[PDB]
């Protein structure tokens, strides 16, 4: 059975944990320890193929733990997440991608840009800006809401489909 190692990265508070938990348990967690970094597993069928997803939900920033180094270099695909109502988290994306491009020693890494918290009013980051950024990286842009579950499966499944084109 094919396994896909995914790594969720992004600034603190953007919803990396909420997105993962939504995908794994189908519920929205309002408060999940911001410091807990762990991997979760899920068997699913994508485009007729039964596969296992090994997802690392990252936490600490500027830190380098043993489990993350491995998943960072062994990670096959990355979900780069920012929040639609957090301009700084969006501006921060550049750093996360430069980071991945180094560890992978390549600018062609399976990746999906994710604009989360799309259930919230008065966004400060326009879909257009994110589309522009994703286009410059040559990757897809998908908006999600860990709260309503909108786009969550699309985000993770599209990343699996990107790992497949590699």
Residues that bind Mg ion (CB under 5 A): 17
Q: Is 154 helix (H, G, I), strand (E, B) or coil?
A: helix
- Piece of the chain touching ligand GDP by CB under 6 A; list 7-15, 103-111, 121-129, 155-163: 7-15
Q: What is the Cα–Cα distance from 44 to 142, expressed in whole angstroms? A: 20
User: If binding is defined by CB under 6 A, does position 40 make contact with ligand GDP?
Assistant: no
Of residues 5, 16, 68, 97, which one binds ligand GDP by CB under 6 A? 16
Beta bridge partners of 113: 80, 141
User: If binding is defined by CB under 6 A, does position 75 make contact with ligand GDP?
Assistant: no
Q: Rg (Cα) of the chain, in Å, rounded?
A: 15
Long-range contacts, stretch 29-35, CB < 8 angstroms, 24+ apart:
34/59, 35/59, 35/60
* Least distance in angstroms from the C-beta of 13 to Mg ion: 8
State which residue, 5 or 117, has the beta carbon closest to ligand GDP.
117
Query: Rounded to an integer, what is the distance from CA 151 to the centroid of its chain?
Result: 12
* Least distance in angstroms from the C-beta of 112 to ligand GDP: 16
* Least distance in angstroms from the C-beta of 149 to ligand GDP: 9
User: If binding is defined by CB under 6 A, does position 60 make contact with ligand GDP?
Assistant: no
Q: What is the Cα–Cα distance from 107 to 36, expressed in whole angstroms? A: 29
List residues near ligand GDP by CB under 6 A. Answer: 10, 12-18, 30-32, 34, 116-117, 119-120, 145-147
């Amino acid at each position: 059975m094919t396994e896909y190692k995914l790594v969720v990265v992004g600034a603190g508070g953007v919803g990396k944990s909420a997105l993962t938990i939504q995908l794994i348990q189908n519920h929205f967690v309002d408060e999940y320890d911001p410091t807990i970094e762990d991997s979760y597993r899920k068997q699913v069928v994508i485009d007729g193929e039964t596969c296992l997803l090994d997802i690392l939900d990252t936490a600490a920033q500027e830190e380098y733990s043993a489990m993350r180094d491995q998943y960072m270099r062994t990670g096959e695909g990355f979900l780069c997440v920012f929040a639609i109502n957090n301009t700084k988290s969006f501006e921060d994306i550049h750093q996360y991608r430069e980071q991945i491009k180094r560890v992978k020693d390549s600018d062609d890494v399976p990746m999906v840009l994710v604009g989360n918290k799309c259930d919230l009013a008065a966004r400060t980051v326009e879909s257009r800006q994110a589309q522009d950024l994703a286009r410059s990286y040559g990757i897809p842009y998908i908006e999600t809401s860990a709260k309503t579950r909108q786009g969550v499966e699309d985000a993770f499944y599209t990343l699996v489909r990107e790992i497949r084109q590699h």
